[PDB]
Design a protein around this ligand. Structure first.
Ligand code: T9X
Lengths: 269, 268
């Protein structure tokens, strides 16, 4: 991968691997989410950032502040097949004092066709107290230089899905997958649970008949609290709807504390 | 990747990804095993086994047969760091009509230093009945021309670790991780539990104190029976010693064996 000519976005090509694909020999949404995280990590490394959190600035490190994901929204039009080359472009935008936003565009490397798009909202937190805060002018000034300053949205549409409010699933759920636990492969280099794991866990409670006859078109996921290495999770789903729509909730099996909520939209093959 | 000058082996370079590494920022053994599978698959394609099947030959596709790993033995000397380029060479070889192998040699792309080596034995399964069977003469004939004829072993020593018999762990185990279940990400393109899941499950029962202070040097794993999508597994470990361990994976219900193996670890 490499920064683009203006140095305000980053592109990387990936050849889809045999173990990255599902039953129809196309990349799973977890593979796509892993490639999104990877091109994002390479973008931050290319402009001088370290690995103690995602894109921690000098002033942030001094003040014990970290960026955390608040939401992830992914829309896929075509999943790339085993052996195909996918090109991903990514950039970050400053959203004033509220936080930042990272966007991605996925393209078929042969035809140049846009095959998918994604967005993510990021907020600032004190690494020790876990308390959120507005972004200071000093911090904003340190990272604004690597961002396009004019609006550049992967999702420019007036009332688009990426900004929809997600309600809380009411007991009892229509479907469930109980007692999910992370293994060592589910942790990142900092020993935290990887954000892609939460995607896999949300999808575990979708009935197999839906997975076998439909394709995932959109997934929106709100991240409330991180799951720790020794936590056990329950995945709950309820249908809300050719298209099938679902409301999702991930909570700790012990106390029932919410960790994630989201929605998925599927289309019959 | 590409076939080598003599067309009897295949090489491919890989740049280690951020999510493929552990706490010391070097590739995990599950990442290594996934890269082994990937260079293996590209080698199978480079000689005419299309992406319409998971490395399966024409006769295998006709008879509804799929490949099954019988055993895997991996020795790593140096795990490649995040962002490093590792070059992997692979080849296949028949051992008369009794064994079918896939070997690998891992190297540091810059220096050419051998950083690891692996071997595996294969059987076949009917994809519908799930009955195992040895590689048939008809299937073997479909790739013998792509194999070196004289022996070419990644582990050439007579009486080496890769061919050692593995005993069965006796109850009670010293350590355990119970109730492991596969999720959709743990399945291969044929909807079977993938090869790295059994490796990850064996290692789950190694105490954290060992993982944090030691590095995995050798892993040998025998595959007795596949775990199905709705099965629940118990991972058992007992120290036999460097630190050495005896491993067993069995179904949580009936206690049916699925895997047995050993690991050898070096203090950092
Ligand atoms: C690499 C550079 C453009 C950058 N990105 C970022 C933000 C942090 C949260 C999401 N991305 N800060 O600097």
């Amino acid at each position: 991968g490499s920064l683009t000519e203006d140095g305000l976005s980053y592109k990387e090509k990936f050849v889809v691997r045999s173990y990255e694909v599902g039953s129809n020999k196309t990349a799973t949404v977890e593979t796509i989410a892993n490639l999104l995280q990877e091109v994002g990590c390479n973008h931050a490394q290319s402009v001088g950032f370290s690995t103690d959190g995602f894109a921690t600035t000098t002033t942030m490190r001094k003040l014990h502040l970290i960026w955390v994901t608040a939401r992830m929204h992914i829309e896929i039009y075509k999943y790339p097949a085993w052996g195909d080359v996918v090109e991903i472009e990514t950039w970050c935008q400053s959203e004033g004092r509220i936080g930042t936003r990272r966007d991605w565009i996925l393209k078929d490397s042969v035809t140049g066709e846009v095959t998918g798009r994604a967005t993510s909202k990021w907020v600032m937190m004190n690494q020790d107290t876990r308390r959120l805060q507005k972004v200071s002018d000093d911090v904003r000034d340190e990272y604004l230089v690597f961002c396009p300053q004019e609006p550049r949205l992967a999702f420019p549409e007036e009332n688009n899905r990426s900004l929809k409010k997600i309600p809380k699933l009411e007991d009892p759920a229509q479907y469930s997958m109980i007692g999910l636990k992370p293994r060592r492969a589910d942790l990142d280099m900092n020993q935290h649970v990887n954000n892609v794991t939460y995607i896999g866990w949300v999808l575990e409670s979708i009935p197999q008949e839906i997975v076998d006859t439909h394709e995932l078109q959109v997934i929106t996921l709100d991240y409330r609290r991180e799951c720790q290495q020794d936590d056990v999770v329950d995945s709950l789903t309820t249908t809300t709807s050719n298209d099938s729509q679902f409301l999702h909730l991930l909570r700790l099996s012990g106390d029932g504390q919410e960790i994630n909520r989201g929605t998925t939209l599927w289309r019959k093959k």
